[PDB]
Design a protein around this ligand. Structure first.
Ligand SMILES: [Zn+2]
Lengths: 132, 136, 83, 145, 101
RNA sequence: GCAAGACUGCUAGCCGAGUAGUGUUGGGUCGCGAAAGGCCUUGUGGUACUGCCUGAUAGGGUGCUUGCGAGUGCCCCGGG
RNA sequence: GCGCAAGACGGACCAGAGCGAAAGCAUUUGCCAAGAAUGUUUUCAUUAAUCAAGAACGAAAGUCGGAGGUUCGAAGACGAUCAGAUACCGUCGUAGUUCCGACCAUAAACGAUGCCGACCGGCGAUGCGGCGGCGUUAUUCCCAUGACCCGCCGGGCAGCUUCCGGGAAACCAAAGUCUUUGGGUUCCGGGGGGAGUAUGGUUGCAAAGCUGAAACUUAAAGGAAUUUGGCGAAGGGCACCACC
């Protein structure tokens, strides 16, 4: 079989993490890049490294990868978790309040609120899976 | 074999009892009463060595022979009465019951109701063997 | 937990516990009254009657013996009394 | 019983149940009630009826035991005996085997045992005869129409 | 030493139960100790059902099932490979083996 | 005697009429339940659905589709 | 396939469910007697706990005398297996297995863990009795009863979890509250073998049961756990110095 070694995989992962804008999907081109920007003591090791780099490009061009962090692929996560919507999902016109917690809230600090309503309780009390 | 019947209007129904054990198969065919039989062919009549009596091939050969004799006589449909050794010995049927039933199905007959008549007891009689059973 | 006010707890815990495991043991039973529409008399019976009780004048039956509290006859009103 | 010519006129001899349902109705975590009676019809025919009843698990039930007390089983069996005794003593053979084609006896058993404990599968497992009287040609002829 | 929390059986306050017999053997084993197996089987196996339904006169004929209960002595059970030995840490798993098909 | 409130049952013109019949496990003040005949305002509007049986569009069983898990379809009268 | 006759047993339902001091107890129904738990604002007032002497019960096997003996089956008779096989296996088969009456008091009679009583964490459940509550059903209204659901109390068979704690550890909510050593009380062990042996006593028709030494010999015999080890142990892979 053809299973890559920790040395080849580690070198390919770190050469993707350091360099990303100087590579591609063509095997011979980024083989020449990997020859130029690194020191590799053999031709066969260089070809194996460039092959795993091409496989890493084919993995990366689909979606996110859980082992490699790329600065061009970074800033997207904080782009998605920085912006906010106009509705805060906490200030509505109706709040689903049970009569039991309504009576609890009346005992707490209040007699009436401007945004609460009372629903009806269920007719049957079943809440657990049948196991005996 | 003969009578005023017609082969197109109706079909002749019989009842076949399949005794399957772990030593031999009894492919028996009776009438609708069950009192009087047509032909009784057993799995030992085909093979010569008794080790092949529990083989499915002997049950297939016996079932094919009794089925060709019965459809030569004029019985077309069969009701299945599968029965194991029974009693206190063994509830599981033998290895030749499936092969015998498939050979009856492929011979050109017809199959009606299927039921099992293994004689399960109401915990009656002490089993064969001692307290420690068979040692091997 | 570790800190429990065993001097005076909430009365739910005394009403929930056994009749002998409280700080001061007290029965959970009470004395009760029976009034019928048919007979114009009032009799005082125990909650756990454990016997057949007849009203004064032999008008109607009033109680039925059970394992626990008695089965009052249907149509009879009651209220708890204390001194 | 007799042949006139080329015809075998038949008569009732017993009722059985198939073994498949007999070992398919029995399940774990449920109980059984069985009753057997020696009742005789309004003619000279004596029957012997066997019955079996099982346990209904409710729809909103979380418990997997579904057992019952012993006195409830005795009361259910007593209801079974008085139902089976009451329903056949006023009738003859034709009416009881006409009733045997549906499960009206089983329906009355499972409807009588409703306030005691629910039952979900009630069937008459077996019918046997013990006493055979003198054969009558006219009764068998009227039994065939 | 003490191998199990119980004694390999299911009696806690009894002292004596009625004995039963093995199926492969004839060994007398107590009822709560023997490894029961209520197997659910039918008449034909996988591929004869098409031939049976082709030869069956009644259309949409439902097939019957065979219900037997099998009782095994533990030596005959292990020799038949229905139960296997487990590790010391994973012995305390009373959950049944998972069924899929 | 004063004074209005919160909740609920039946009916969809009303009186006949909750009278028989049926009904169960134990009862009750007991469920289910239509006319004969008469007087009128001469019959209040909206809204989805309906596999078969028992005992309601409820309750409890149990089906058909392609083998399973899940959709959809299955009161009747008609037309295309 | 239809019937008859005899004896034995009570399958599926049957579960880490119930009762009983223990040995043990499973077809429906009838009769007699007893008992735990629960309920009580009933009754007496310390009647209580453990126990030499003594007493009752006590699986199977074994003995005596009957009736009966279906199946199974010591001893025995053979056939194979094997170098030997009076063993595993297969076919017959006497006592015995079943019931009554009279014996003996032996088990891994084991939870290998004396009885009573106080304290010391949590959680999901199970069986019983009692208490309280939204709802569905025994066809539609009410109440009580049964059947579900939600919780509580008391006794019990258990289960999961925990760095309470203990132990040599396996493990135990008791085997904890133990050097910071004392709640009450009965029996019982001082390295291994000789030896549960010999004599004596007692009991028994008999077999045997209880009580129970000594000379001599020995430097270890053991309990828990760890690591390659070997399995005619199981689960996955490999090799023409293995096979097909
Ligand atoms: Zn075995």
């Amino acid at each position: 079989g053809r299973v890559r070694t920790k040395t080849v995989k580690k070198a390919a992962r770190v050469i993707i993490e350091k360099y990303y804008t100087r590579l591609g999907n063509d095997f011979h081109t980024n083989k020449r890049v990997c020859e130029e920007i690194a020191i590799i003591p053999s031709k066969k090791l260089r070809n194996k490294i460039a092959g795993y780099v091409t496989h890493l490009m084919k993995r990366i061009q689909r979606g996110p990868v859980r082992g490699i962090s790329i600065k061009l692929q970074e800033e997207e996560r904080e782009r998605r978790d920085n912006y906010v919507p106009e509705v805060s999902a906490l200030d509505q016109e109706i709040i689903e309040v049970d009569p039991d917690t309504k009576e609890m809230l009346k005992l707490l600090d209040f007699g009436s609120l401007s945004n609460l309503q009372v629903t009806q309780p269920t007719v049957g009390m079943n809440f657990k899976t049948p196991r005996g | 074999s003969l009578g005023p019947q017609v082969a197109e209007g109706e079909n002749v129904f019989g009842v076949c009892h399949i005794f399957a054990s772990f030593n031999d198969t009894f492919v028996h065919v009776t009438d609708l009463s069950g009192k009087e039989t047509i032909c009784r062919v057993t799995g030992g009549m085909k093979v010569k060595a008794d080790r092949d009596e529990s083989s499915p091939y002997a049950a297939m050969l016996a079932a094919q022979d009794v089925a060709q004799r019965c459809k030569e006589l004029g019985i077309t449909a069969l009701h299945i009465k599968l029965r194991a050794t029974g009693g206190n010995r063994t509830k599981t049927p033998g290895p030749g019951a499936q092969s015998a039933l498939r050979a009856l199905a492929r011979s050109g007959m017809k199959i009606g109701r299927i039921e099992d008549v293994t004689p399960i007891p109401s915990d009656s009689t002490r089993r064969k063997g001692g307290r420690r059973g068979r040692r091997l | 937990p570790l800190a429990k006010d065993l001097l005076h707890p909430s009365p739910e815990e005394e009403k929930r516990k056994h009749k002998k495991k409280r700080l001061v043991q007290s029965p959970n039973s009470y004395f009760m009254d029976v009034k019928c529409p048919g007979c114009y008399k009032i009799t005082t019976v125990f909650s756990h009657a454990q016997t057949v009780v007849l009203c004064v004048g032999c008008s109607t039956v009033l109680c039925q013996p059970t394992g626990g509290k008695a089965r009052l006859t249907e149509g009879c009103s009651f209220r708890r009394k204390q001194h | 019983e007799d042949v006139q010519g080329k015809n075998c006129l038949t008569n009732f001899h017993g009722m059985d149940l198939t073994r498949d349902k007999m070992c398919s109705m029995v399940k774990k975590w449920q109980t059984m009630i069985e009753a057997h009676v020696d009742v005789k019809t309004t003619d000279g025919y004596l029957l012997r009826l066997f019955c079996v009843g099982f346990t209904k698990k409710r729809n909103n039930q979380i418990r997997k035991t579904s057992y019952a007390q012993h006195q409830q089983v005795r009361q259910i069996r007593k209801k079974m005996m008085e139902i089976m005794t009451r329903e056949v003593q006023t009738n003859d053979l034709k009416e009881v085997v006409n009733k045997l084609i549906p499960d009206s006896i089983g329906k009355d058993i499972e409807k009588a045992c409703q306030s005691i404990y629910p039952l979900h599968d009630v069937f008459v497992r077996k019918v046997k005869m013990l006493k055979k009287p003198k054969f009558e040609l006219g009764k068998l002829m009227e039994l065939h129409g | 030493t003490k191998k199990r929390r119980n004694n390999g059986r299911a009696k806690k306050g009894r002292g004596h139960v009625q004995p039963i017999r093995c199926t492969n053997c004839a060994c007398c084993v107590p009822k709560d100790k023997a490894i029961k197996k209520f197997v659910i089987r039918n008449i034909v196996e996988a591929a004869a059902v098409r031939d049976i339904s082709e030869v069956s006169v009644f259309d949409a004929y439902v097939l019957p099932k065979l219900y037997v209960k099998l009782h095994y002595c533990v030596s005959c059970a292990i020799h038949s490979k229905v139960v296997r030995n487990r590790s010391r840490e994973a012995r305390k798993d009373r959950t049944p083996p998972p069924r899929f098909r």
